[PDB]
């Protein structure tokens, strides 16, 4: 046993030495990458000054891109005994003990331009630009001399033809979580339109619903939208659960491989794969459940029936299908603290207007001043005179977006910090492996 | 000769259908036993071959 | 820290050594008796009666 | 649109495969040598005992 132990310990020490070697190789590779990153940092700092001509910007961008490509290259072909250390976020195990399980794990990260980030540093992008003036002549919106402030020299201009479409309202209401939409004559559920106030109880996800006895014969169309679909379900008569499958309101086939359930129990109306009565159908089991006060609840909707029609409780229709269904009908969908009315056409009340990116009940109101400037509020003290350029839409900003990097230096520091953290991790692993080698040599000598 | 447990992992069968005497995982009657299903099958002329 | 080629070489050597173990198990005999071929019992007479 | 190339498409990979094969064959020889040495030691012990 001692001979076995000493041989195992010696070979484990050799393995730990191999781990030392691979750690050193990775350390050197990351050192070179760090050198390149510092070079790129100082180049970016030199390029940050605004006193540089365009040609200087192109030259600096070319050299920065070349050095980034060099970083990607050195990440790519860095290898050790058929293993690419920097090509994956993997973990590498080294056997250090003479028994099973005594291993040391090395943390390795995939390093490249993409992982470090910024996907193209693009300093040479067209930077900060001044925006053009209001240009009173271009705005041809609706003319309105109402002037609610009473100033004679102010003229209100509104940009009409911004009537939001039904799909726009649906996207707006779907964007927020916890909204309220009231609709009638919906596909599948709500087709008979016996009830009108559903409100669809939007909680977290695709629209839910709640209905009275309206789907008596509508299970086949709703649960099976296609021509051959089959959906699983669970049926219980109270205190005793059974698993079944439903297809086109026909035979309630059992969930087993080929078991087929027939209807029986006149007066109890129960299931059996081996019944002794006529054929089981969804229409008949509907009144069966209604008389026996059972449930036919499934994963996508909890259904129960009283009489000869099912009472839907916890429906969940697909959001896209619901939106397609409610595109050309009357509904009064509401959003947070706002109510919107649609009657067989988008913005029937003519109170829906599309803002810059959000649906708002009021049109963009622009005021024309005596001096020709265009302001958002009648009081000249405020307003933030509107400007024009490169995007239309009459943006109230003096600055257009620069495609160059928003915060170059901060991202560069983040990348350098990541590389230094990896460096420190490899150094710590190296020291730990060396200590393990020393301890293991002592142990094998003593043994 | 006690509970006629379903061949499922944990499903338990309960008989019902007075006059047809059928098996169900969702029965609406008393607990199922071999003694009474014996006369049920005898009256209805079925087979329980194993 | 080993590539698949090193694993292949080590496995080949291990299989060769195991084959040697099987060979030495089969071959070792003492005067028509294979002492490692069966879970048998061998009686040695050490008494006069 | 393109003529065939006489130069080997991937010299390095095929060469490395050649080294892989030759060292594999060498490993086979090493295993055989160790096996034979063990057999010789065993046989010497057995003949001395016999």
Residue numbers in the entry:
A (entry chain a): 53 to 499
B (entry chain b): 301 to 350
C (entry chain c): 103 to 151
D (entry chain e): 450 to 499
Published text:
The rotating flagellar filament primarily functions as a propeller, acting as an Archimedean screw, and supercoiling of the filament is essential as rotations of a straight filament do not generate thrust. Here, we show the atomic cryo-electron microscopy structures for flagellar filaments from enterohemorrhagic Escherichia coli O157:H7, enteropathogenic E. coli O127:H6, Achromobacter, and Sinorhizobium meliloti, where the outer domains dimerize or tetramerize to form either a sheath or a screw-like surface. A shared feature in all four structures is the formation of symmetrical homodimers between the outer domains of flagellin subunits, with one outer domain rotated 180° relative to the other. These symmetrical dimers are the result of outer domains being able to adopt either an “up” or “down” conformation.
Since a seam breaks the helical symmetry in the EPEC O127:H6 flagellar filament, reconstruction was performed asymmetrically to 4.0 Å. The power spectrum of the EPEC O127:H6 flagellar filament superficially looks similar to the tetrameric Achromobacter filament. However, the Bessel order of many of the layer lines must be different because the EPEC H6 outer domains cannot be reconstructed using the tetrameric flagella symmetry of Achromobacter. We have determined that this is a result of a seam. The EPEC H6 filament ODS is created by an outer domain tetramer with most flagellins being in one of four flagellin outer domain conformations, but the details of this tetramerization are quite different from those in Achromobacter. Due to the presence of the seam, most but not all D2 domains are in one of these four conformations. In one dimer conformation, “D2 Dimer A”, domain D2 of one subunit forms a dimer with D2 from another flagellin that is 11 subunits away. In the other conformation, “D2 Dimer B”, flagellins that are 6-subunits away (Sn:Sn + 6) form dimers with each other. These two dimer conformations are easily observed in the 4.0 Å EPEC H6 map. While a large region of the ODS has very poor density, the resolution of another portion allows the creation of an ab initio atomic model of the complete flagellin structure.
